[PDB]
Amino acid sequence: ERPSDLVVNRLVLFVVKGTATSTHNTVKPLILLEELGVPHDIYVVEKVSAPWFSEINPHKMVPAILDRSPDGRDTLRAWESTSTLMYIADAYDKDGTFGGRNVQERSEINNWLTLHTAALGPTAGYWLYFYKLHPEKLPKTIEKLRSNITVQYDILERRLNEPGQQYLALKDRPTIADIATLPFAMKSTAELFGLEFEKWPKLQEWSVRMGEREAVKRAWQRVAGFGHGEKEYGMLE
Amino acid sequence: SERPSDLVVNRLVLFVVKGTATSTHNTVKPLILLEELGVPHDIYVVEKVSAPWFSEINPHKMVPAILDRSPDGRDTLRAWESTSTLMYIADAYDKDGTFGGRNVQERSEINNWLTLHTAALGPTAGYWLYFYKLHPEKLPKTIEKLRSNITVQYDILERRLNEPGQQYLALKDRPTIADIATLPFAMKSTAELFGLEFEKWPKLQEWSVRMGEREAVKRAWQRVAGFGHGEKEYGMLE
């Protein structure tokens, strides 16, 4: 079965009702969609648990993307934020502006993108679970995860301190790697972790440089408002 | 912080450590693909991942890592994080898209299941092994929760493999970098280390034995166990 209003004519990004702690992963694909000007629709999921949604993403989370295939005969699906970034970059960044133009560029883009996906992303994800969602409070665990977040921030700082290394993967311009990292490496998010983000200056400078991009501003502005517009759930107009 | 005398990049150099039961689950992943594609490569057994010269190669101070020559051969590039190593090898040495994916459709599913493993099972297992063995104190209330999350992942993989003709995680027809990335953390030996009955997920076990029958996978497990236990313990192997 399926919902009535769910129809794919363009890329379809699945999000939830905007909050502080529900947007840090959904904003990632939205930043890239805003950077490339890809035509897309927003579908606000009421219950990620809903059986129809688990057929789209078996991990039962946002973001998730349903899109028609290149030919336009069949539809494609992408889930896990890092997997949404790659799929867009594959299908919409033909110039490799954000995906990488050759093997050498991609090699560094996949390094920093994957580092985030495997280290800082899960570490931050587990931290938020044990802090807010876990029925019991385990402060020894929450402390060890907060300790691991600083180890990651350190690795980002070290990289951004290297000569002319303005962005994480490439010196010259931002890549999906930078988009994947920004939501878990900004002053707002550091403060939530109970960290002084000034301690990592170059990582703070980097976050501000990224934050001043019009596409990043629009993404944060829009992702906050989803589910608080004229339509509470389903396909937004 | 000198780069060791014997460290030279004439071809793809895969960085590993001394082979154990604990030290081959991530370093086997790029080695499986290298064996599957028959890529010419060297093995460099790192004595100390803490060594400052190694931190210049992989700032996360872990294996696997890769130094390789650029396509033209004039420049030197690096790959670190097991999932990053697979994606690089596929990009540089899998032009047919046999494991990397041939078109957008195939890659979409390959990236999905690859990323799931990279973001969910991989980091969950890695945190589980840490608190169990490496963390000075043992906190039972936390460690149980990670084991409880490993099962939720095993359940998602079982649901996928139960779909009609879904012989492999990403694609129906053949194995991809997604399957190579998941295997080490979804096999009977690794399920028993987690204190789980791997029979409870039949199709996932069927998948795990079928992947083990592949000659490239057998060669990888064989070789990765033997690194550092040969005549040369550390440095570039021959």
Beta strand extents in chain A (DSSP E only): 11-15, 40-44, 64-68, 75-79, 234-235
The dihedral over CA atoms of A63, B119, A88, A209, expressed in degrees to the nearest 10, equals: 90
Interacting residues of A70 by C-beta distance below 8 A, sequence separation 6+: A91, B103, B104, B105
**Do the strands B76-80 and B65-69 form a parallel or antiparallel pair, or are they unpaired?**
antiparallel
Contact A182, A190 (CB under 8 A): no
Enter the DSSP assignment of A184. G
Cα A181–A185–A191 angle (5° rounding)? 150
Half-sphere exposure of B131 (CA within 13 A, CB side): 21
User: What are the contacts of B205-212 at 24+ separation with CB within 8 A?
Assistant: B206/B161, B207/B157, B207/B161, B207/B167, B207/B168, B207/B169, B207/B179, B208/B183, B210/B167, B211/B175, B211/B179, B211/B183, B211/B187, B212/B183, B212/B187
User: What are the contacts of B69-73 at 24+ separation with CB within 8 A?
Assistant: B69/B9, B69/B10, B69/B11, B70/A103, B70/A104, B71/A102, B71/A103, B71/A104
Provide the shortest C-alpha distance from residue B223 to chain A (in Å).
Answer: 25
Helix (H) or strand (E) holding B80: strand B76-80
Q: Reduced to 3 states, what is the DSSP secondary structure of residue A34?
A: helix
The dihedral over CA atoms of B175, B179, B181, B182, expressed in degrees to the nearest 10, equals: -160
Both tokens of residue B157? 């993989």
Third-level CATH fold of B104-217 = Glutathione S-transferase Yfyf (Class Pi); Chain A, domain 2 (1.20.1050)
User: What are the contacts of A94-98 at 24+ separation with CB within 8 A?
Assistant: A97/A35, A97/A36, A97/A173, A98/A32, A98/A35, A98/A36, A98/A174, A98/A175, A98/A176, A98/A179
Enter the DSSP assignment of A234. E
A44 DSSP β-pair partners: A15, A234
Q: Reduced to 3 states, what is the DSSP secondary structure of residue A101?
A: coil
Residues of A near B (Cβ–Cβ under 8 Å) read 58-59, 69-70, 74, 76-83, 86-87, 90-91, 102-104, 106-108, 110-111, 113-115, 117-119, 121-123, 126, 130, 134, 136, 138, 140-141, 144, 155, 158-159
* Statement: A103-216 belongs to CATH 3.40.190.10: no
Contact B78, B66 (CB under 8 A): yes
Residue with structure tokens 């096999």? Answer: B187
Instruction: Judge residue A122's burial from the number of C-beta atoms within 10 Å of its C-beta, 0-12 exposed, 13-18 middle, 19 or more buried.
Output: buried
Instruction: Judge residue B41's burial from the number of C-beta atoms within 10 Å of its C-beta, 0-12 exposed, 13-18 middle, 19 or more buried.
Output: middle
What resolution (Å)? 2.7
**Cα–Cα distance between A15 and A22 in angstroms, integer?**
9
Measured between CB atoms, which of B71, B111, B119 is closest to A122? B119
B236 DSSP β-pair partners: B44
Contact B178, B99 (CB under 8 A): no
Residues of chain A in contact with residue B83, where contact means CB-CB under 8 angstroms, are 110, 114, 117-118
Measured between CB atoms, which of A77, A110, A138 is closest to B142? A138
Q: Select from A68, A114, A170 the residue whose CB has the most chain B CBs within 10 Å, as the one to mutate to test that interface.
A: A114
Technique of determination: X-ray
Alpha helices, H only, A37-171: 51-54, 81-92, 103-115, 121-128, 139-160
- Inter-chain contact A87–B111, Cβ cutoff 8 Å? yes
- A167 Rama class: left (phi>0) / alpha (psi -120 to 50) / beta: beta
Q: Reduced to 3 states, what is the DSSP secondary structure of residue B4?
A: coil
